[PDB]
């Protein structure tokens, strides 16, 4: 069962897709602590555009809250609510 060209072109085109991102990427100024899980599932702009001069960028954004465990080594831990930025919609635009 081979994947057909249209179903490749369609499913590979710039669209919001579930993407796992490190917390340390999004919160760099957190050297003291460790977060578990370190990565979280967010909707981000994955894919590729038709032309060289076009780039897949977020058009519409929104925030999402999740329960994350912050651990301070040898000093306990706590489950707390952390906000994160995710993309509801993407589109190919000129690279400028």
């Amino acid at each position, epitope marked *: 069962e081979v994947v057909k*060209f*249209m179903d490749v*072109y*369609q499913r590979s*085109y710039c*669209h919001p897709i579930e993407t796992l991102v490190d917390i340390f990427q999004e919160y760099p100024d957190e050297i003291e602590y460790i977060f578990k899980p370190s990565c979280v599932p967010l909707m981000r702009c994955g894919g590729c555009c*038709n032309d060289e001069g*076009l780039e897949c960028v977020p058009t519409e954004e929104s925030n999402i809250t999740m329960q994350i465990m912050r651990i301070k080594p040898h000093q306990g831990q706590h489950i707390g609510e952390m906000s994160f930025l995710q993309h509801n919609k993407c589109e*190919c635009r*000129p690279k400028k």
Partner: nanobody
Amino acid sequence: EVQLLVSGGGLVQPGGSLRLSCAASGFTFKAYPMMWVRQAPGKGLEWVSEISPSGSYTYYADSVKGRFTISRDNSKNTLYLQMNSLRAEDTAVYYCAKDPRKLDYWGQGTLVTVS
């Protein structure tokens, strides 16, 4: 606010000829590549052709190349498809799209039939 509006299709006998015309609006037509896709009844979607934003590059499917000829006028915001020497296998509904996955737009498709 996108509107891709197609016209030209109908009925013609084998070894015929047709010229389809897509009329785009709602975005910077000049900066995007455009494409043609078709869907035969009972069959899946199929890619037919593409054209670059400048209009200096063209791409065609293996089942049609040599016969069909794509072209665009960026001054008028219109895409064209010169379909020649038609066969029964080409019988399908022809859609013009800037981006796949967006075949919902009104008047975007047109029926081309071979007797």
